[PDB]
Design a protein around this ligand. Structure first.
Ligand SMILES: *[C@@H]1O[C@H](CO)[C@@H](O[C@@H]2O[C@H](CO)[C@@H](O)[C@H](O)[C@H]2NC(C)=O)[C@H](O)[C@H]1NC(C)=O
Ligand SMILES: CC(=O)N[C@@H]1[C@@H](O)[C@H](O)[C@@H](CO)O[C@H]1O
Ligand SMILES: CC(=O)N[C@@H]1[C@@H](O)[C@H](O)[C@@H](CO)O[C@H]1O
Ligand SMILES: *[C@@H]1O[C@H](CO)[C@@H](O)[C@H](O)[C@H]1NC(C)=O
Ligand SMILES: *[C@@H]1O[C@H](CO)[C@@H](O)[C@H](O)[C@H]1NC(C)=O
Lengths: 98, 290, 49
């Protein structure tokens, strides 16, 4: 006698029922890093901000629709985002002949 | 089981004017000190809503206080009472048990949301005997539990936590909508009042669930008061008392929202309402110069 | 004189992913480690969601 279990799952993806992903990861701070906190993706630096969020708020925004702050799902702490340093470069020369 | 209601009653569906009520956070994002503009389903300002109220107390005629009401895209269900009678939002279907059916019966042992494919019953009314503990003995809304899809149990919902005074100890303001299938229920609780109040408020979101079904119209429910004092048939033998609750309707519209510095909504102005409007919205500022 | 050549950008070092915790699992042990089984004919039809 062999005990056998049969498994059948449907398709068409519209009644999102069970699933998964999971696959959590540790946290970093004060360094440029790509983040996927809950589905939003971006690049910047992480720090602490005194601004507070309402209990139902997920992630903040600002004028000109930029992702300002995100709340970490694991700990529910307000974190801030600031991109890596970027800017133009200029060269000063006194003349190649001189 | 379930019993068909009798002694049908017809009263005029009185009307009253809404005064800048029913504004809810459209998106789950945080802003501050910005006058954002949106466009979604809302309740138009100064809309004419269909008033309902519970009359014919004791066992005079007792009224049919819970008729069948249509559902297009949303409701602004409200409630003002003291004894916590309004419950049971049985809606979301064609009421023919054709597809998955929804109901919200709470303030039981715990707040629960039973959602099943049960075969319907013609007249719904929840038994609440005049005993020490009001036991919901008779689920007269259905007489079967043929199939079920989802079950929900939540501790906090419709909590009537207020002081002990004879005024109207609640002011419920719900918003029922189906975003392409997903049911999002926005709600809030308001302190007592001493007749819609001309005030401005925001509606915090609550738990949502996909389900996904065809929706035809709406039906409400009230707590019964059957007792041995009044001899009545199983169709109708309960004392009504006195209660009031309004019903509105939602539709697409364009709104302008002003956020506080903590992020709570503090003021809103409706577009396409008055000639003064469509100028306040256009300049994107609440103050307009000559 | 003075001239502009190009720009410079710092590159991110690592990547991190987060999610709203993992406490909500599907009950599966009670099926695999079940007190009793079903017969060859007929079978229990369980629903997980
Ligand atoms: C996620 O589940 C854990 C299960 O214990 C909750 O407790 C956290 O556990 C982790 C790992 O042991 C700790 O790093 C956290 O400090 C714990 N949280 C607290 C508040 O102490 C945790 O609360 C859950 N996270 C949620 C629900 O967001
Ligand atoms: C015109 C207006 O401002 N309000 C009217 C109200 O007077 C009337 O009672 C109701 C139904 O007849 O329709 C609305
Ligand atoms: C596919 C479809 O719309 N079916 C019916 C429609 O025939 C009916 O008119 C309406 C209520 O009036 O309910 C729905
Ligand atoms: C640099 O100086 C020399 C010396 O006069 C001159 O011939 C030359 O043209 C100068 N370079 C340029 C780019 O003008
Ligand atoms: C914003 O919240 C703070 C508490 O963090 C409070 O002191 C302040 O009064 C609030 N803003 C307004 C306009 O009331």
């Amino acid at each position: 006698p062999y005990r056998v279990v049969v498994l059948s799952f449907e398709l068409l993806h519209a009644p999102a029922t069970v699933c998964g992903p999971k696959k959590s990861t540790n946290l970093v701070k004060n360094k440029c890093v790509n983040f996927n906190f809950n589905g939003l993706k971006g690049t910047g630096v992480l720090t602490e901000s005194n601004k507070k969020f309402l209990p139902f708020q997920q992630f903040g925004r600002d004028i000109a629709d930029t992702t300002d702050a995100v709340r970490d799902p694991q700990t529910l702490e307000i974190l801030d985002i600031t991109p890596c340093s970027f800017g133009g470069v200029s060269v000063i020369t006194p003349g190649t002949n001189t | 089981q379930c019993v068909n209601l009798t002694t049908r009653t017809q009263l005029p569906p009185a009307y009253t004017n809404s005064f800048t009520r029913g504004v809810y956070y459209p998106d789950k994002v945080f802003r501050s000190s910005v006058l954002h503009s949106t466009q979604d389903l809302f309740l138009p300002f100064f809309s004419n809503v269909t008033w309902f109220h519970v009359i014919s107390g004791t066992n005079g005629t007792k009224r049919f206080d819970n008729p069948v009401l249509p559902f297009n895209d949303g409701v602004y269900f409200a409630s003002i009472e003291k004894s916590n009678i309004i419950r049971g939002w049985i809606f979301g279907t064609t009421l023919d048990s054709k597809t998955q059916s929804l109901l919200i019966v709470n303030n039981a042992t715990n707040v629960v949301i039973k959602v099943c494919e049960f075969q319907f019953c013609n007249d719904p009314f929840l038994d609440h005997k005049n005993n020490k503990s009001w036991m919901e003995s008779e689920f007269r809304v259905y007489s079967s539990a043929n199939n079920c899809t989802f079950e929900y149990v939540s501790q906090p919902f419709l909590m009537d936590l207020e002081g002990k005074q004879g005024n109207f100890k609640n002011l419920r303001e719900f918003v029922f909508k189906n975003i392409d299938g997903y049911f999002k229920i926005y709600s809030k609780h308001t302190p007592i009042i001493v007749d819609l109040p001309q005030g401005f408020s925001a509606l915090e979101p609550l738990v949502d669930l996909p389900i996904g079904i065809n929706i035809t119209r709406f039906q409400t429910l009230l707590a019964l008061h059957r007792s041995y004092l009044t001899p009545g048939d199983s169709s109708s033998g309960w004392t009504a008392g006195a209660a009031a609750y309004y019903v509105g309707y939602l539709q697409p519209r364009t709104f302008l929202l002003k956020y506080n510095e903590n992020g709570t909504i503090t003021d809103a102005v409706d577009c396409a309402l008055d000639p003064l409007s469509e100028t306040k919205c256009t300049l994107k500022s609440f103050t307009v110069e000559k | 004189g003075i001239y502009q050549t190009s720009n410079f950008r710092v590159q991110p070092t690592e990547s991190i992913v987060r999610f709203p915790n993992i406490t909500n699992l599907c009950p599966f042990d009670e099926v695999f480690n079940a007190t009793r089984f079903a017969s060859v004919y007929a079978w229990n039809r369980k629903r997980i969601s």
